[PDB]
């Protein structure tokens, strides 16, 4: 286990080398704007009739056609929603890839899972961000950068793992340190934390608090700061110094009561479905189970949208950052 | 309840008639090949750019394109897997179908089940054979058969159940007997039996036992001699003799332990799910997952294919059957 | 771990011995031939107003008293159902043992145990063959051979890994691979086996699906074919291959069904029960229940088997494997 | 099914044979004396240094040594304890068994199961009473009998089933009727019968009544009278006439709380129990027990009948029975 830094990594493998960035969403208009400030030979290949094509074309990047882009560079950089990069890939990219030719991802879905069958005789590695697309580009301007995995799935120019570790300094990951891995433990780990932890976590855990003081009468907007504005202002001490930094910040009174009632909410009913959530992953239930939400035409996760955008947390906690100025 | 057997069947109502055999996989191979064995009038219908035809071609056999061997003949083999039959039938069969025609299956699962409406004035019969496709063939080349299921769906002609008799003899199904039963019996007797039995329940019981003894501390290497290679040797008695010529040969230590433990293993909870195994089987609700699995692209399977080949038996098991010689 | 096989082994140590094989039973008569057939100086020791010494002598072997072999040989290798092999040894054996003399078995039972304490000076070895008697013949009929365990639990002359291995050779067992073990590995794993998979498991698995169908109201015929009689197609290829060569083989509608149903069959209840099973045999309690069985005079045993002869199974299966020729 | 009775017997096969009776305990002295009553050739086979000896021969009988008896008597009837019948009858009758004799007994225990293994030639049937052999007598005297099976194991003069018949009628059985039935079906009702309902289930059934008053605090004089003698007055009844005979002579205040509680006392728990307890004997496991209760020495048997002995409603029941002159 070796971590990469920036002083371990160098941009050899990609000075003299065209790299085709295709998409601009999250990640996609992120990770191409940080290659550019770093002065890296970057092409956008967006649709003619969407959206973003205005917006990358307004940012001062070189807009072309997928296939434009795609035909013309060394390195093709995929940063579009899995569900539909199976399409894309099959109609607008693999008639442009030629012998010697590389195929990056920021996420080992596609590949690992078998949506994305590459030709003999091409590179396919990964560059994975471990963060939001937002906070990728955000950190890189203020000097830091995110965590990043680096992954060799096939290795034809024995030039692969350069590659992917030039264009992992390019983005700004390097700061943080670069980690070598494979799809398979990228792809798994990776939904695994979003589900559990990162995003299925954290909102239920904040959704299950609020409406505990508001059932018991206490005001909607006291509870907002307590359960959910408060939390951001505790996670950066964890960023910082872990748990340590934060037990220390906190009055002993917090850190009392949050010693002995914790294991209590996480309880081992929770630790059991953890296991079993990491299991549906690992043998393909879950995509199995999200091919088929997008197959069907996404009314459960449409459907699921729309009653959390009427969850009264949501109300009164749009209502409480607009009038301060936290958001426009 | 009548058996049929080689006294009692003809090749009278094929001996003027061509054949095709749309497949050249597990059965199709195995079944094309011992029909030509008995001197019948088979031609095979395979892809053109696909592997099989060069395979059928080394063969000895009048490889010809799916559309001209379904056009030249009278009865229409199809040997291809239940999920792709649908598309291949409507494209490149169903045009070439006219009246008087015989449309021959192995397996009801595509007629039963409605992925298959043949058209009016057309014979519509199966010849299944109960084993392997390697099985059959070699089976047949030993001077024996392997067991066979004969059904009519559609009669028009008035000649198909004399038609599948005939094509059942030539297959080498008559020497161990055939019995005439619905498209319904065969379809649902067959998902159960490999689901509960032949397939999931043999694997899961070796597997169980294995990992027993190896968590015991036990050596791999003989817990594979003990628990699954010795198994072969075993069934063969009751393939021979039953369950009475088996206890006999076995000493009576194994012939005592395992008739006061095997309620232990195989228990009223195990028996509970062989009844809903079959009501998920009888309601569509096993075909509505399985051809869900094929839209959605196999992640799920195919990961199942991944983790059951990281299995430590597989590994010590192909171990032992190299140094010996049993697998190349 | 180290495995012998034909290369790895030589007759040296047995080149100039007399070897007693008493008794003439499953693995007596299998062992016994194959000795001779590897032209080897072989004594049968059988009972004078028994059955088998007719046998014997009907073989072309030098069939002569227990006593008269025992007294002759320089080793005695012990073929005679455990539960008697106690007294069989201490009055017919024991006496004729001379220090440099071998005792030798196929199974550690009466050994490990302590049914039988050999006297001091007198060579302990086993030789165990991994399949039942039957096969053990047959196997090597073809030009192959059964797996087989060597084992020492006294030295005297220093010779004993040597003379087992000699032996082992001779049965066949180094064809297909020969592993030193201990007695108490032996036994354990052989009781475990033959009562958990190979002999209990197997046919309450087969039972319980056979019943399952019939009691649903499928024909019982068609319920033999499907659960009982095309398992014996399918071992074959694990035998040969494992589980990859099976699943390939078999339909993909059959893997992916046996792959998804099978943890519903093998549940955790019956993993449970097998931890249970081993631990009865370890602590010596299977043992105690079936000596005390032999004692009482078999009549659970007995009634056992009577009831299992009245099986609808094993009514439906015999006619069938009759009319094919199967079975005489 | 056809019930023999009086009219439809006769003494043929029986008026010229002699006929052993072995043993003089319940059965034994019980149906020897009733067959002499009815003018028939018997000879009782007993123990010289034994007390029953002395006892036959006060009775007016023939008193023989066994083996005398055995190589008088065409006839060999065995009643002794099942327990001891075995070693018995290898030593004291097998040898006078000649090829065209008839050995009978009163129930199937030791030839089901297999204790006593008959030789080629002889014949074996069973007359059966279904009753304690203290009433088989009383029953006679009074011009009454008891039920009686007949039962046919080997039948070698083509004579069996006319001399158990005749011997039936002598006994007095073919008063209150005799069937036909297997040895295997008298051995297993006759077992569970005596288990779970004439001896096990009332005598059970009083002591939890009896206790229920007594730690009431109700006299046990009183719960003795209202518990368990008046039972032997309502048993009566049914003998007589059913359960309608006995609903009608007692109260229908008695009428409406037995109908209304009894579903309380015998549940569904015990309904499952008398299930089990069935199969134990199907399946020999009953035998096993009792089987290995007597190699043991009967310490659990024995400490049984102390413990029972020591019961109160024993003492209470024995001071009220011998007050009244019921018992000397
Ligand atoms: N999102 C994250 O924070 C994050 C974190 C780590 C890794 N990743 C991985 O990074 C990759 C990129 O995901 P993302 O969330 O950033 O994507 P995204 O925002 O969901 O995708 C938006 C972009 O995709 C384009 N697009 C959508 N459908 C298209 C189609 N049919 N043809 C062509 N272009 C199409 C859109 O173009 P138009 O304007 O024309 O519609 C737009 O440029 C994924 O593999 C994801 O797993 C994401
Ligand atoms: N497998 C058994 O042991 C078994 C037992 C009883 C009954 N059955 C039944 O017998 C039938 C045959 O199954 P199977 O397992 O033997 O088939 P299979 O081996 O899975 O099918 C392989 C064959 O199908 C061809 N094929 C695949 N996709 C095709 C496509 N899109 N167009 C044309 N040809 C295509 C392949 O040709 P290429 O070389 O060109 O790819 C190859 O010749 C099924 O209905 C099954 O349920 C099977
Ligand atoms: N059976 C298997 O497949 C298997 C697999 C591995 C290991 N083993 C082990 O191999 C050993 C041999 O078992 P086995 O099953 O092959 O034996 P078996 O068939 O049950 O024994 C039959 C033989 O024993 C003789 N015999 C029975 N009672 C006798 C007595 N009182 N005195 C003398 N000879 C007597 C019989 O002679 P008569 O003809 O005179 O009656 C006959 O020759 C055992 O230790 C067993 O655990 C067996
Ligand atoms: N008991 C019943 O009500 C009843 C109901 C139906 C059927 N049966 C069946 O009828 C049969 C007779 O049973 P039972 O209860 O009447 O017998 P039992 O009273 O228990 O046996 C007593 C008799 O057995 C003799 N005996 C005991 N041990 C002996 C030995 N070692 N050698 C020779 N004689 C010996 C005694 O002779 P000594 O005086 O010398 O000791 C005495 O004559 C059994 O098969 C039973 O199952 C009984
Ligand atoms: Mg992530
Ligand atoms: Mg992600
Ligand atoms: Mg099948
Ligand atoms: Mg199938
Ligand atoms: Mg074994
Ligand atoms: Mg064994
Ligand atoms: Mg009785
Ligand atoms: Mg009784």
């Not at 909607?220 to 960023?239: G, R, V």
């Not at 199995?288 to 009164?316: P, T």
Request: net charge negative.
């Amino acid at each position: 286990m070796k971590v990469f830094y920036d002083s371990d990594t160098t941009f050899d493998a990609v000075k003299d080398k065209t790299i085709a960035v295709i998409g601009y969403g999250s990640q996609g208009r992120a990770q191409s704007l940080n290659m550019k400030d770093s002065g890296l030979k970057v092409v956008v290949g967006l649709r003619p009739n969407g959206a973003s094509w205005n917006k990358a074309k307004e940012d001062g990047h070189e807009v072309l056609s997928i296939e434009e882009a795609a035909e013309k560079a060394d390195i093709i950089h995929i940063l579009i929603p899995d569900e539909i990069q199976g399409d894309v890939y099959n109609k607008q990219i693999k008639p442009y890839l030629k012998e010697g030719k590389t195929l990056s991802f920021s996420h080992g879905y596609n590949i690992h899972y078998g949506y994305i069958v590459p030709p003999e005789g091409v590179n396919v590695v990964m560059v994975a961000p471990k963060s939001p697309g937002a906070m990728v580009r955000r950190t890189y301007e203020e000097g830091f950068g995110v965590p990043g995995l680096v992954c060799v799935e096939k290795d034809a120019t024995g030039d692969a793992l350069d590659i992917a570790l030039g264009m992992a300094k390019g983005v700004g990951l390097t700061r943080a340190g670069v980690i070598q891995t494979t799809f398979r433990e990228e792809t798994e780990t990776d939904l695994f934390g979003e589900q559990a932890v990162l995003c299925g976590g954290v909102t239920e855990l904040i959704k299950a608090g609020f409406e505990t003081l508001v059932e018991a009468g206490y005001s909607p907007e006291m509870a907002y700061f307590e359960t959910c504005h408060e939390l951001k202002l505790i996670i950066d001490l964890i960023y910082q110094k872990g748990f340590a930094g934060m037990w220390n910040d906190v009055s002993n009174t917090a850190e009392y009561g949050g010693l002995t009632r914790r294991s209590r909410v996480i309880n081992e009913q929770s630790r059991q479905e953890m296991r079993k959530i990491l299991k549906e992953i690992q043998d393909g239930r879950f995509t199995k189970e999200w091919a088929l939400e997008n197959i069907s035409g996404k009314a459960h996760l449409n459907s699921m949208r729309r009653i959390e955008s009427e969850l009264l947390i949501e109300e009164v906690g749009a209502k409480l950052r607009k009038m301060c100025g936290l958001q426009k």
